Amino acid sequence: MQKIVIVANGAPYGSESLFNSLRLAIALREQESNLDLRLFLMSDAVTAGLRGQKPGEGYNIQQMLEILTAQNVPVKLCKTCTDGRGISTLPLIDGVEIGTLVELAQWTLSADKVLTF
């Protein structure tokens, strides 16, 4: 089975980077529905897992994540990063969970293609 891992570093709404990331993932999912795709969000991107994002503009990062964690795409947030920005205890989007660098390593060594945004 093809195993893809996308790791995002960009902060939500400030970097078009995080936005493109979730767009690729959502796209990759449809093309090859049977694809083992996982997501690890580092540094700034970690705040993306917060509930209640109410964008007035256009795209909604919470919505894009829910589209993924509804089709069963693992979405993890770096522990040290969420702990520093105080998001570990706050309400996170559904299929979004806290993860570690070690698991991220595991995914990396196990993946066939690792894309970094």
Positions that interact with a copy of itself (CB under 8 A): 2, 4, 7, 9, 11-17, 20, 23-24, 27-28, 30-32, 35, 42-44, 47, 50-59, 62, 78, 80-81, 83-90, 101-102, 104-106, 108-109, 111-117
Residue 85 C-beta: closest distance to a copy of itself, Å: 6
CB nearer a copy of itself, residue 74 or residue 78: 78
| Alpha-carbon span 19 to 95, nearest angstrom | 18
| DSSP secondary structure of 62-106 | HHHHHHHTTTT--EEEEHHHHHHTT-SSSPBPTTEEEE-HHHHHH
Q: Let me know: does 25 contact 6? Beta carbons within 8 Å.
A: yes
Q: For residue 95, give the 3-state DSSP assignment.
A: coil
Residue 7 C-beta: closest distance to a copy of itself, Å: 8
Residue 68 C-beta: closest distance to a copy of itself, Å: 13
CB nearer a copy of itself, residue 14 or residue 70: 14
Residue 5 C-beta: closest distance to a copy of itself, Å: 9
- Sign of torsion, CA 22 27 32 34? positive
